[PDB]
Write a protein that binds this ligand. Structure first.
Ligand code: HEM
Length: 112
C-alpha cells in the first residue's frame, strides 16, 4: 500500500485533463502480485459512469453529502503507461450531458 498519484490527459493532447481535479488522494496497493489503484472520486453525482480499459470502476464506498463522493477502485497492468478511460458527466441543472475519453497514467507519488 503506497501513496500514489494519478495524471490525466485531454485525450490525445498531453495537456493535463480537467478530470484530474475530481480525483484526489490516489493510493496504490498490490494484491495477488497485481497492481490495484484505490482513488477518491469527489463530486460523484455528476458521474453517470466511469469506465477503465471498457468496464466501470468498482465503488467501494458511496457518500451522498456534497454532490456525492465515491471511493472508486480499478486495476492497472503496468505503472508508467497510459491507459484509456471513459466517463459520462451528467449535471441535470446545468444541464451538462457530455461523455469523454481521456488517458491516464498512475504513478507513485514520491520516490519509492
Ligand atoms: C464533474 C464535472 C466535470 C468533469 C469531470 C469534466 C471533465 C471534462 C473532460 C474529461 C473534458 C475533455 C478532456 C479535457 O478537457 O481534459 C472536458 C472538457 C470540457 N469541459 Fe468539462 N467536466 C466537468 C464539468 C464541466 C463544467 C461544469 C463545465 C462548464 C461550466 C465544463 C466545460 C467544459 C467544456 C466547454 C469542455 C470542452 C468541450 C468540447 O471541446 O467539446 N465541464 N471536461
Amino acid at each position: 500500500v503506497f501513496d500514489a498519484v494519478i495524471k490525466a490527459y485531454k485525450d490525445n493532447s498531453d495537456e493535463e485533463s480537467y478530470a484530474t481535479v475530481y480525483i484526489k488522494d490516489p493510493k496504490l496497493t498490490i494484491e495477488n502480485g497485481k497492481r490495484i489503484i484505490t482513488a477518491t472520486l469527489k463530486d460523484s453525482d455528476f458521474f453517470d459512469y466511469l469506465k477503465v480499459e471498457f468496464h466501470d470502476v468498482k465503488v467501494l464506498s458511496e457518500d451522498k453529502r456534497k454532490h456525492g463522493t465515491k471511493v472508486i477502485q480499478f486495476e492497472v497492468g503496468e505503472l508508467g503507461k497510459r491507459y484509456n478511460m471513459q466517463m459520462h458527466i451528467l449535471i441535470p441543472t446545468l444541464g451538462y450531458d457530455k461523455e469523454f475519453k481521456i488517458q491516464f497514467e498512475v504513478n507513485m507519488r514520491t520516490f519509492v
